[PDB]
């Protein structure tokens, strides 16, 4: 039940000693399914730091201190292993390789595009695959709609304008317009679809009076000629 | 498949027009469409039927 978010909620509510998660087998082990080895850089580790620093006062009501300290031992051991491996890795380097430039370009651009979830070109119907497109657009809409409205730039070209304490520079909004062109272009999609239908179903709906090589064929001219035959008058 | 279109007529005429030019250059065989319709054993079997009809009618 997200104990690694329950610690964050108890920290941000500023009352963590008053509850202390009721560390028994019935409560502290029901959310764990040891502790699950936190994932973040420090956002789930500083919480463990503060949690141990608050639980130094009771020291016996909470039996889960030992598994947390075992994970501190694991973190210290992994850190010492990485420091020894970084000491050896800087000694295992060849004296000459002369890494190529125009492949370093491609690795940097490819890593940068693979960070922020966009498609990388290689250079090295069916409503199953219709929903898998219409579920990537809701991703982008509900990711752009969580940006703060007070978003603003600071380009490297405001130094040539000498902005005072209150001067209102003229390149402050080169990202918030761009973060609304996407968010409103991804909501006007089923309007340009309905305009493209009215375009194609009135250009292709003639198809034999505008295109020259179709209205000059034998069979099209014969069909258009034969539909215009006025019915025979008996007597 | 009961009806025809402009695409069907154009494809039929283009196919039948390219099959005729490929017999001058002899880059297509077309021996199967020849011999499945000639079929000389069927021809002599039919001639034997005509001969038996001559015998039965005389």
């Amino acid at each position: 039940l997200q104990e690694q978010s329950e610690l964050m909620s108890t920290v941000m509510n500023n009352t963590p000693t008053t509850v202390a998660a009721l560390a028994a087998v019935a409560a502290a082990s029901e959310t764990n399914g040891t502790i699950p080895k936190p994932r973040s850089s420090a956002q789930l580790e500083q919480l463990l730091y503060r949690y141990r620093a608050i639980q130094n006062h009771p020291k016996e009501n909470k039996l889960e201190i030992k598994a947390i300290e075992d994970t501190f031992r694991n973190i210290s051991r992994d850190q010492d292993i990485y420091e020894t491996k970084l000491d050896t890795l800087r000694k295992s380097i060849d004296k000459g390789f002369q890494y190529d430039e125009d492949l370093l370009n491609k690795h940097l651009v490819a890593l940068q595009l693979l960070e922020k979830d966009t498609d990388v070109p290689d250079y090295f119907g069916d409503p199953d695959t219709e929903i898998r497109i219409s579920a990537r657009i809701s991703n982008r809409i509900n990711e752009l709609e969580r940006l703060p409205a007070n978003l603003g730039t600071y380009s490297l070209d405001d130094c040539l304008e000498f902005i005072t304490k209150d001067d209102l520079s003229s390149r402050m909004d080169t990202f918030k317009i761009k973060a609304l062109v996407e968010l409103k272009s991804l909501k006007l999609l089923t309007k340009q679809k309905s305009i493209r239908q009215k375009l194609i179903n009135n250009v292709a709906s003639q198809a034999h009076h505008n295109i020259p090589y179709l209205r000059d064929s034998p069979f099209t001219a014969a069909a258009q000629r034969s539909v215009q035959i006025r019915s025979k008058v008996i007597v | 498949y009961n009806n025809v279109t402009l695409k069907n007529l154009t494809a039929f005429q283009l196919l039948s027009q390219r099959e005729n030019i490929c017999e001058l250059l002899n880059l297509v065989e077309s021996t199967e469409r020849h011999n499945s319709i000639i079929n000389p054993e069927r021809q002599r079997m039919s001639l034997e039927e005509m001969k038996k009809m001559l015998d039965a009618l005389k």
């Binding site: 491609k106 | 250059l25 002899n26 880059l27």
Partner: peptide
């Protein structure tokens, strides 16, 4: 982990003789 310019991503990114041999003959 600095983003790259968009205008740089957009910047880095036997059938012959079979007729002739039959056209020479006929």
């Amino acid at each position: 982990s600095l983003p790259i310019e968009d205008n740089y991503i957009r910047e880095v990114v036997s059938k012959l003789m079979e007729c002739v041999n039959d056209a020479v003959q006929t």
